[PDB]
Amino acid sequence: QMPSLAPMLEKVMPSVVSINVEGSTQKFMALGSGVIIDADKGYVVTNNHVVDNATVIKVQLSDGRKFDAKMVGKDPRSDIALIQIQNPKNLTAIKMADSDALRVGDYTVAIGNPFGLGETVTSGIVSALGRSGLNAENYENFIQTDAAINRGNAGGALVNLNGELIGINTAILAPDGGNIGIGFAIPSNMVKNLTSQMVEYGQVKRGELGIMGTELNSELAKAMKVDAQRGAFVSQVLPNSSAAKAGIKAGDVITSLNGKPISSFAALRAQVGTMPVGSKLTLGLLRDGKQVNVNLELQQSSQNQVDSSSIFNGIEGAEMSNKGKDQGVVVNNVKTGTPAAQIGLKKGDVIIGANQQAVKNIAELRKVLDSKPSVLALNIQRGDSTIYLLMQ
């Protein structure tokens, strides 16, 4: 009698699908993997970079069955996207485990579609947790694993010996485009939070504590006379922010979140970045060598609230949000050399309406895009001037 993963895998494998995508940005073809979250609704999670700028999305099950899928939500900041299988028939969803129980050393199994070979299973262990830094602008709290992951595994499942999802394989560290034992996956808990929002809102309502900060290294610890050589250092707290109201002051070092210790500022950022607005949480602070506890509640971020690719499905490089009280959609910030600025869009603009329809908030705007007109005419206002921006 030999030990084997087969027993566990035959139950779980149907839950992992492989995704084929056709798009344009110049036509391109890509492929990856996904995981069935809701067998009924036909919800399938995957990496945003797999289904980004996609005209056609088709899902192929383990048994060979093909389906067509339509986008449901996408969050470039966390590289998590959600699609839905059209005409879901006889599917198998996977059970998610609490990623917060993971410990370096736990055994892991990776399931995906490497080089389109088909459903491929590999194994390994948790190399490390809370890894981040691959993209300082992204919310990343990666799980690291030596389990074989290559091109195609993206959006794939990373499960424990009980066949429970612990993460979604996203990227690898490879100088030759080939796995060398270092793969990263997004913690299941983060996926749980992000997808559940996409299911209801079609996007993520990004909340924030409203604090500026940076990584607490040994050097900075010396200067600030701090014990901990790691954690989130509070550079400053924004006025009228949940953090401010909570009693967080600058020069503080955050050490724990809801009891769970903090690996780094980047990790904390990713943690809360996935939690829904109004989520009540508690932080462990360290000011003047003194342990402090605080109760917080996530709020509606006034600035940098929402990216543009989340509304135009393919237009990045411009963040925007609602303005005051149904006063239109103001643009918070714009990146240079991006699809958005390519049409003129600049920071400070306030969308009054589109296609002769008034726009008070993001809901109204999205309402016009649901019509899917051939050309989009935005009636924005720069300074005291009123202009238009055309699309397509």
């Binding site: 699809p339 390519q342 049409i343 921006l389 055309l390 397509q392």
Partner: peptide, 16 residues
């Protein structure tokens, strides 16, 4: 061709 003797497709924005 001729020889001497994003946004709407018909044109970028010209000034009158």
């Amino acid at each position: 061709w001729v020889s001497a003797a994003d946004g709407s497709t018909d044109y970028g924005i010209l000034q009158i």
